[PDB]
């Protein structure tokens, strides 16, 4: 099992506090995008294109539940994992971390990015309000812990993680 599986909106910090922890507790990150690129051989935003969401879900689902298993550093899910209801089932019993931020932050940390298909383009902070306002329910139902991530910086964020682990 992971010693921590970190869950959260675009922005919320789970490719870097998941990096910057699994360095903290001397083990390996597994970013679920990053495996889904890998796997592939394609971009997330070429999946989307081509063949849409509802493949990326499929084809995430499995890379999470096998990581699950198999995987004992740090995951960090995709942000939009815990919207598939057979994520939220294997998640059950697992460590699972919550990154919270608003949406005003989240969109200005987002705001120079352009590989999020379902945030790229103009209207962002429309959105972004509609994806938190959709997923907060699913990102709460999961979490083990919640960590608020608005006035943190990364470094405390990890801290604040390390000393409520294990
Ligand atoms: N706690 C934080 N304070 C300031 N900037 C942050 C924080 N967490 C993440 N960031 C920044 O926000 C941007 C998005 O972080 P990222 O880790 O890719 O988020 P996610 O993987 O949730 O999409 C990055 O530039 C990162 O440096
Ligand atoms: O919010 C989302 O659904 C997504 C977030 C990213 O982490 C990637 O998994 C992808 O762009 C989808
Ligand atoms: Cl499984
Ligand atoms: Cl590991
Ligand atoms: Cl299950
Ligand atoms: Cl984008």
Same mark, same amino acid.
């Given at each position: 099992a992971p010693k921590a599986v970190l869950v959260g909106?675009?922005?919320?910090?789970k490719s870097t506090i998941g990096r910057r922890l699994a360095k903290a507790l001397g083990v390996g990150l597994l970013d679920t995008d990053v495996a889904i690129e890998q796997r592939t051989g394609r971009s997330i935003a070429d999946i989307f294109a081509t063949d849409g969401e509802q493949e990326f879900r499929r084809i995430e689902e499995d890379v999470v539940r096998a990581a699950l298993a198999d995987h004992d550093g740090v995951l960090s899910l995709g942000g939009?994992?815990?919207?598939?209801p057979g994520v939220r089932a294997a998640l059950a019993g697992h460590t699972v971390v919550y990154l919270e931020i608003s949406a005003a932050e989240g969109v200005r940390r987002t705001?120079? =990015?352009?590989?999020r298909p379902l945030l790229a383009g103009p209207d962002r902070a429309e959105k972004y309000r509609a994806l938190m306002a959709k997923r907060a329910p699913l990102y709460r139902r999961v979490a083990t812990m919640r960590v608020?991530?608005?006035?943190? =910086?990364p470094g405390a964020v990890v801290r604040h993680i390390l000393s409520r682990l294990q």
């Open positions: 909106l675009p922005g919320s910090g939009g994992a815990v919207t598939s705001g120079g =990015n352009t590989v608020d991530t608005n006035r943190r =910086n």
